[PDB]
Design a protein around this ligand. Sequence first.
Ligand SMILES: CCC(CC)O[C@@H]1OC(C(=O)O)=C[C@H](O)[C@H]1NC(C)=O
Ligand SMILES: CCC(CC)O[C@@H]1OC(C(=O)O)=C[C@H](O)[C@H]1NC(C)=O
Ligand SMILES: CCC(CC)O[C@@H]1OC(C(=O)O)=C[C@H](O)[C@H]1NC(C)=O
Ligand SMILES: CCC(CC)O[C@@H]1OC(C(=O)O)=C[C@H](O)[C@H]1NC(C)=O
Ligand SMILES: [Ca+2]
Ligand SMILES: [Ca+2]
Ligand SMILES: [Ca+2]
Ligand SMILES: [Ca+2]
Lengths: 388, 388, 388, 388
Amino acid sequence: TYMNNTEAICDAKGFAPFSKDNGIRIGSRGHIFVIREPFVSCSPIECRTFFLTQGSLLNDKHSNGTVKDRSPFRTLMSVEVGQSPNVYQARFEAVAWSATACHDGKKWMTVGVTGPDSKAVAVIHYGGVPTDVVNSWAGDILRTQESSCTCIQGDCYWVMTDGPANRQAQYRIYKANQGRIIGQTDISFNGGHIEECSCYPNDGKVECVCRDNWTGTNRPVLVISPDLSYRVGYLCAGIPSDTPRGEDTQFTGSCTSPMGNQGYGVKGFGFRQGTDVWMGRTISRTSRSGFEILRIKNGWTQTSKEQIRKQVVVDNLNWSGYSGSFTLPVELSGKDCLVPCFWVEMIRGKPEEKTIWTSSSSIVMCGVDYEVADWSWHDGAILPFDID
Amino acid sequence: TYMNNTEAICDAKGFAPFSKDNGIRIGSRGHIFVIREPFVSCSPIECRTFFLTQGSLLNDKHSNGTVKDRSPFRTLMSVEVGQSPNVYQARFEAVAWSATACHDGKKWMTVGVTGPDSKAVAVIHYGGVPTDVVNSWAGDILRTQESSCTCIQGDCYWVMTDGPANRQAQYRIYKANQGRIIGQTDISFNGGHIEECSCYPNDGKVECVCRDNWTGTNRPVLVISPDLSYRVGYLCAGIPSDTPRGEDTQFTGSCTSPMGNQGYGVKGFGFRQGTDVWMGRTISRTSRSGFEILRIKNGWTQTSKEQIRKQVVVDNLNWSGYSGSFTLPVELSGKDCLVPCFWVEMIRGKPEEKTIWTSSSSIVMCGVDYEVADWSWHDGAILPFDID
Amino acid sequence: TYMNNTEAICDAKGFAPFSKDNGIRIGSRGHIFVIREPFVSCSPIECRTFFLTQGSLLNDKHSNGTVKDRSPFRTLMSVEVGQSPNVYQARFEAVAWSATACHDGKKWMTVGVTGPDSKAVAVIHYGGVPTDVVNSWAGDILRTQESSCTCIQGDCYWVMTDGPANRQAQYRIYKANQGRIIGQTDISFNGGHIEECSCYPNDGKVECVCRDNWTGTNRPVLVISPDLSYRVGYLCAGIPSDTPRGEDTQFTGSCTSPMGNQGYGVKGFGFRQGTDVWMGRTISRTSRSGFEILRIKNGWTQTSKEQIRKQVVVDNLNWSGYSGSFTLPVELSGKDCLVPCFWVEMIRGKPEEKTIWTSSSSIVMCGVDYEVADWSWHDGAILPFDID
Amino acid sequence: TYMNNTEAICDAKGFAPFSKDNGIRIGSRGHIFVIREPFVSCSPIECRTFFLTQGSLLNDKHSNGTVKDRSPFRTLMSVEVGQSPNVYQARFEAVAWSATACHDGKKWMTVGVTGPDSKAVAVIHYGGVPTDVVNSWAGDILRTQESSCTCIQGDCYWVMTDGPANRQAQYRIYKANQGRIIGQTDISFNGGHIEECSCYPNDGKVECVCRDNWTGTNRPVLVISPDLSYRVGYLCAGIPSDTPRGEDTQFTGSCTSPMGNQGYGVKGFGFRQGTDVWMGRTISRTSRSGFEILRIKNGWTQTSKEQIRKQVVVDNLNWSGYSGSFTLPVELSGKDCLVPCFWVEMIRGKPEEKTIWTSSSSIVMCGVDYEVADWSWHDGAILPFDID
Ligand SMILES: CCC(CC)O[C@@H]1OC(C(=O)O)=C[C@H](O)[C@H]1NC(C)=O
Ligand SMILES: CCC(CC)O[C@@H]1OC(C(=O)O)=C[C@H](O)[C@H]1NC(C)=O
Ligand SMILES: CCC(CC)O[C@@H]1OC(C(=O)O)=C[C@H](O)[C@H]1NC(C)=O
Ligand SMILES: CCC(CC)O[C@@H]1OC(C(=O)O)=C[C@H](O)[C@H]1NC(C)=O
Ligand SMILES: [Ca+2]
Ligand SMILES: [Ca+2]
Ligand SMILES: [Ca+2]
Ligand SMILES: [Ca+2]
């Protein structure tokens, strides 16, 4: 039976640990994939960690040079959340150097984008098999979320980017039924830049918090109705949740325009909470180190930095990276609303440590009704490996 | 359909071997987790070994210093009983450096407690996903059984400790429906100390045998009705089943007070048998070596040491450690009552052997209707490993 | 319920990536079988990669001399498509040094041929267990497709060869119900040579494109009704899709006779498309390097080389090998017709590289309704391995 | 639903290969258990390989001295037939240094016998959990088949031995319903010796061919009705199928008495075929080398050596060992009778080869309606391993 992500978000007070794979610590000996983009996404029955492999395993020579972001050996596979991205438990989902995956209550749709930088093709899988195909409309690295895509009453949505990554590019939405592309829409944000959205279903509409990789230290935002009418802009809160970013003291927030004079960025997430927001970000403001989630009073519809709640998930002395959003269906949490959860990717190796390789492990957290003590669930792996 | 742990315990005469993983012997080559607290617990369909990993694997450098009891890499995972705690068969249950897990006849509830020593949070998982959260009420190492928790007609119960470990602390019961905390109760035992209970369902009430880590060489005891009214005290039998302990010759038993002048302790178990008791303990009275189960005539309601039955499971020349209790549901044994089973953790490595590491394997036994020959199912691993 | 491969083929425009195992790249560290003949085949529920092992694993001494095509250690096993042929995920299907496998909508029939070159026996497995047996009728290496066999409304068909491999031999069809041989038929092609057919269900009839290993650089062809009446000949198109082959400039096509003066060959595939054909082949015309698929206008019923569509799957600078055909059932793609898919085997090691061993990995593709950018999904493994 | 092994045996003409694990060849690199007694046994749905591990893995130091037949680390586990006895696919069945296992159409009963030589206990598992316990009645190595046990219409039977192994001992039958011992019977064969029976269901009665380890080179035989009335004796055929044995030329057969003047023996099998027999045996008559199956005209009820059919499964230049019998249920083969299948254990290492270790792999065969070419499916492993 179809799965109804119609409900709003359970207003949540803190975040409690859900899972941790220790993949990289395990990889020293076990047979673990060198991975990246380890996102989470649930079905009426299970939560899964999706990932992108470099076609290799930790502590092997083939993990050499796994910094490179786009290879023909790259594949999207999945394991049950908390389980490390190891060979013998992984399902192959698709070939991909960029991806997204979700469940309509019946089957898993996954989208694997591969091919030459010039014309990349996006391969929709519904229930395992390729069911539809999306070519690069603009011939500059067709790409996608690197996090869960949303499915509201059987129909699934997601955001793709094409064009350069250091200036204006183009941004489309896509819609599908059982792996069938039955709808698309152009996102017009001139002077904007929308990368790797972190989406979730709220109040019937899928809300996204994304990455301005051009000039924004604040995050693109966009709300999507099932008819593809959208509002796109920026997270109103006057607290830059990107990296690199400026200081909280010196920054002006906008619901309409990119702020700061910083290029670059990194994937991130936010959760509306009526009027407030939960927003994640690295602790360091220049490096991908540490992690923490912030609750901003009226941060969702206004430019304030009122900080009701703050919580550290990883300390500033430890490597983080991507983070992303998903929800627990109703058929799982028992809640009467979609529990806001998220994950954090903790990258290790190149280009900051003595390794030929580059991989990440994760730490997932979930919205509960109470506040939770601050701590650090860091990767905890000892580098270099013998293959150095 | 819900599972009725209403029945009393099948009065049992001996204990026959149920499973043995040989994890540590296998770990020398295979990819096995460095583990500890390997408890067992059954559902209407399967029996599972739950465990706590150090986020590492045997014979790898990351297993270095796995004596430390509380790390952020620590996770509760599970395998089918008898199967070793290996990577590729393990389900992730929760992050935890202390835990308990059981099945209400419908789903698995697991409780993983993690976080900083000061304010640890306990994360209830029901059917995999975090469903409820329990903060440290007393800011001193919130912790739990390290063995199966009980579920009587759909509702599950268990015992947590908070406060120091070498003197007075606090002890609560908790109750849940489908991962929902719908009840708690304070256990008042001033001058007592209740650690890591080994519970089982008997006569409708969940009975526990626990660890006095303060002054008792005899074991705290407590019986719980579904309304949270409890009797708490000590195992009446005048035979100290803790470690370290004094001699059986010189010891006076109490149903009310801790006896002996010994600090420290170790997890252990007992089974009421009408009036008698089955109680386990290490053979050595000062060291965690060997193991044996004893039947005491009227040991449950009186201070006698009548020894009807005795049986050695592990010899005094071999390492043991924790032990713990569970039952076979009715939907499994076919019996007309809850078969009393138990397990024994056999620790190896630090601090007694030439290893950077510390792990354990197990040997599970079950209540049968006849007496069973004595023997030793010892870990059987050869240390040190190459990583020494 | 039985599975109806009655429909014709969805006329298709391009081919999009479906899966890629990276087995050989993974094998450097993980425990992967040394394999060959990695074909694909789907059931109403899953797509599987079938393979032939040398009874050994990559980077082990037992993979030494795994060039030899026929050993008693050879076994047909299977994994889910996209998953590498690794030990812990593989199901044993049958013992075999030549094979085929398919699903009647209810169970998997597999055919494993083993034994001495003189009298090899073919062991039909239906649903795992041996159900029927086919002896070598002509005492010269009884063999089969090395690709999917077809099942049209519950009955399954396939093509076997017996006799020499460098001149005239004999060619039979076989038919079965639930693993029962209930029909066979002799294929009379004097002056022809039919090896390793790549079959699929079209318009109710199973069409095959095969390998002339005698004199043909063009491919035998054969269409089979469920009553075993057949048309056999050659792919009309005047474009030689075999290897080695001559140039496209100098070649005359036939629907009746073998053309070219070349011995040898390699497995290959074609798809009728009404009147047109999709045909695969290596890029190199003398070596097993590269890969590409071609659409020929009226290539199916006439001798033309009109090239409507061409697409490179692997570049001429990289090793390929076998390729083969299968379809996505209706109970999977959702399409109203059988989606034409194929696979490519990419061989590595002996006799062209510095290895004691010989294995292959794969890259599968599927018929979509649009054209897809050209690229190379090459094996990507680094040889030699430490065992050199 | 219960499974009816009421039918007689399909009269069969030859034997075709069913599976082969290559465990030892795979073990050189993969994580395979050091094993022995690898028997096969089917349920209404799957065929499984059961085995006894030494609690260790090939090519590890713990496999050192795995000649010893009885250890406390010994465990009975299982995999799907054809699959090697590897860690990550194995289910733990029971602790055991001697065992048997079968399926009543509903669940798997397994019997694991462990303990001290003096009083060994046999632990009946039904559906995984220990359900019943059988003590050594005669205090001399309680033991069992080391092959499949039989289940005729829901009730399961098997043969145990106790007492010495080089002279008179005692032999009982046992009967169970859903793991419940509801029946036993004493087998009186004074001057006889019944070891490790190979049983199967025929004509409603379970027939056994066993091992005289005292004086017989011919095999004990016994037929069992569901009421425990039995005929016990020897295989009438005047062809000694044991090892060591005398020559076929010089030997007189008996249906009543042991013949030959040879001590020792090895597990073996026979199949009645109306009046004829299929009987297996090693080729060598003094060593456990090679293997072959023989059909003897009226061999079942008379002392003749008429040889209608003979077939070699393993050549005299290769190691064999145990062999044993099972059947394919009706719910699997589709046949109208129980297909006679068997397996062969091929031992390697100590005491004949340069290894600290001793293990075996297997090759299973099945009754088909035609004769099958002779060949050798030998273990094929290269010794010694690096750990020598
Ligand atoms: C900065 C451009 C960015 C997208 C905004 O490219 C991604 O950058 C990163 C990263 O760590 O910043 C990791 C991924 O592998 C890249 N993805 C692809 C499809 O190339
Ligand atoms: C002595 C205090 C004891 C609880 C009474 O702490 C446990 O001690 C042991 C042990 O082997 O004695 C092992 C566990 O890892 C510890 N658990 C935690 C949560 O730290
Ligand atoms: C050239 C003869 C050919 C069949 C036409 O034999 C196959 O040749 C090849 C190959 O790579 O060309 C690989 C297989 O292992 C062989 N199969 C068997 C059963 O021996
Ligand atoms: C010769 C006595 C024989 C039984 C007749 O003992 C078995 O002998 C062998 C063997 O290879 O001959 C292998 C087993 O491990 C032994 N089983 C036990 C329970 O010890
Ligand atoms: Ca930015
Ligand atoms: Ca104590
Ligand atoms: Ca040719
Ligand atoms: Ca004998």
